[PDB]
Structure formats: structure tokens, C-alpha cells
Amino acid sequence: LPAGCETAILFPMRSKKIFGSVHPVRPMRLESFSACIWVKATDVLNKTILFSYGTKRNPYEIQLYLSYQSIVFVVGGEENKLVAEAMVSLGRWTHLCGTWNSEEGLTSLWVNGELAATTVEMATGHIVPEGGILQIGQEKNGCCVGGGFDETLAFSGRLTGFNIWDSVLSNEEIRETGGAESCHIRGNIVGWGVTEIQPHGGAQYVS
């Protein structure tokens, strides 16, 4: 387990059926936010969508994915994105965090409690609309067609601590969530064990 957790998803095999359905309880109102996460990637491709919140008219409303030895940060749509280079590789628990603002379009990334990317005037004044759904480990593809889901974009590996925050996280708290006692640090939008998480098609906890 990454730092002090005892539970983690297993994702033993990426196939055309592995996915999950999360049903958060509270609104997604966000003109700014931050999202720490610990990840253990087994294989990284040019395109492998770890998750993406999508609306009926904007499936790419939120998304981040690893492009070989790089990390992509998609906001709002495919066109608007931020990328850092050569930080994520196969098989190691690594803390990923970031921040965004709509006032002057400020956004940033924080790995291991340490900066990874930053820019300004992106998604300035943007507000995420509701009505979409957040999906983990898969992109929009067939589910019950004897497979269907893109095994290419599917994921295999260990994950734990699915959390989301309603506002920006200070650099101090980002560092703390990058520390060895980050398992108990959870956000309010989503908290591990607090938010409804429904693995499917292979994603197994290792509690």
C-alpha cells in the first residue's frame, strides 16, 4: 500500500469490461479546485484515460492521461490542456496533485507534494456544468457487447484513496498529502469510503 493505507483497487487485468461507476452525493460547483491522488501505473501508452468527467455535450469536460513518459491535463475540452514531461512510469505509488482558478485562468500540478506544471489565463472564468458523470479507468466505449470497452485505454494496476476537493489546496496541504500520512487526508467533494464507488469488470479491492 502506498503510504499507510490498507485498501487499494487491484485492476488485475485491463479488458473490454473493466470499469467503475461513481455516484457522488453533492454538487460539482467548481470554478477552482485541487485533486491529490496516489497512483501505481503498470503500463503507460500515448493515450490511457485514467478517468474523465464528461457531459452529454462535452465528454472531455475533465480528463488527464499519461502520454508515454508524460502527463497530460485536459480541462473543459480536448483543445484546452496542460502537459508535463517524463515523470510517470511503470509500477510505483506516486502522488499527483494540481490546482485551477477561473479568475485569471490559473492552474498548476503538484507531484509528491512538488510542482510539476503551471500556467495562467486558461479556462478563465470557466465553470464546470453538471449533468455529466465521472468515470474511472475507461473512456466512452462499449460495456455489455461481449466486451466493447477499449482495452487500449483500459488500465491495470493498484489504486487507493479516491478523493476530490471542492476548492484549491494550499501548497502546505498539498505537501502533506504528498507525505507518508496522506492516507487520512481526504477531500469533501469525494472521500474514499465516503463517496459511492462501484468497481466493475476486474477492479478489485486489496483490503
Added chain:
Amino acid sequence: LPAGCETAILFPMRSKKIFGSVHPVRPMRLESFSACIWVKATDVLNKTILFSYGTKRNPYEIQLYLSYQSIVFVVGGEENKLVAEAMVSLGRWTHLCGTWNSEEGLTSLWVNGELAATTVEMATGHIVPEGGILQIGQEKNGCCVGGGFDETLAFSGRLTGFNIWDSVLSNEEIRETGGAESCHIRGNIVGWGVTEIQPHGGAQYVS
């Protein structure tokens, strides 16, 4: 049997899952086209979506929906439509059919094989996109989610003789399709009993 047909589909109750899955054989890419049908208007609400063909970027590519007394026929989008006034019935096998072209934006509607309405230079040059889903008996929405199909948009009743053509039908052919010897003339785009049709969510085949 009406129109000489030998099979039909019953929509016994307007419900949030009642619909049918239609998969026409050939592409829908047409400029001048026509399609006629017999409808037994069981319920005529202020809005009872008869069907809805929609592409991802345009939910209202093609949509015929029935109002209290008017057959509102939408082409391309909500902006362009063709509408009748006081000649739609309740609980009676009735004929409604329309044509369209992009050359000069021609369009028409045909009740009981008799012309109903028409306008010119409507969507001139427009080409209907292909590859979309031809949802029937209900405006496109979720079914497996559990309900999803707004019952107001849902329709109930018996349906027979589904036909789609690749050209504007002549007046003589419209009269022929409006008679008791109209079952045999079935559309090449879709022919009653040719294109696979699966009533679902309460609907069943009937004859």
C-alpha cells in the same frame, strides 16, 4: 387488414422504457427523400414525440412530433419545421407523410395521401447527416438506466408499415401508399419486415 399489411407493433402504454431499436441496412446520407407511415394516434398530448433521429452534435437532426391538433415536422433542427393545423385524429389508423429536398429547400406533408403543408427554400442545400441512431416511438434518451424516456415524449399505440425511401415520393405513389394496397411498397432505406425492428420496454409486435 389496413394498408394490406400483415404485421404491426403495439405500444400498449406510454412508459419511460418503451421504444424500439432500428438499424437500417444502408447509410442515411440523402438530399431528397421521403417516408410515409400509418399512425393510430392513441394519445395526442400537447407534445408526444413520435420519433427522434439525432446525431451526437445535433439531437434534432430529424424529428416528427405530434401536438394536440398539429403534426409538427422538424427538418434539420428546431429552427426549420412543417406543421399541420387541425387534422390529426385520436384512436384511428391515420396516414402522415412528408418529403424534403435541399436543391431549393422543398418540403411537404401528406395526410391520408393528401398534401398537408409545404414550404420552400427551407434548409436549402442541407444534407442530412448519416450514421446516427433512428430512435422510434420516443425521443432519444436512456433506456437501460431505468426509465429515462420522458413519458411525455413517449407514445402508445399500434404501429404498422414502416418505410423509408431515398427520394421524394410522387403524388401518385403517395396516393398508392395511402390506400389499402400500400403494404407491399416498402422503403428501400427501411422496409417493414426488412429492417430488423425490436419492440422494447412494453411495446410488442402485433398483427
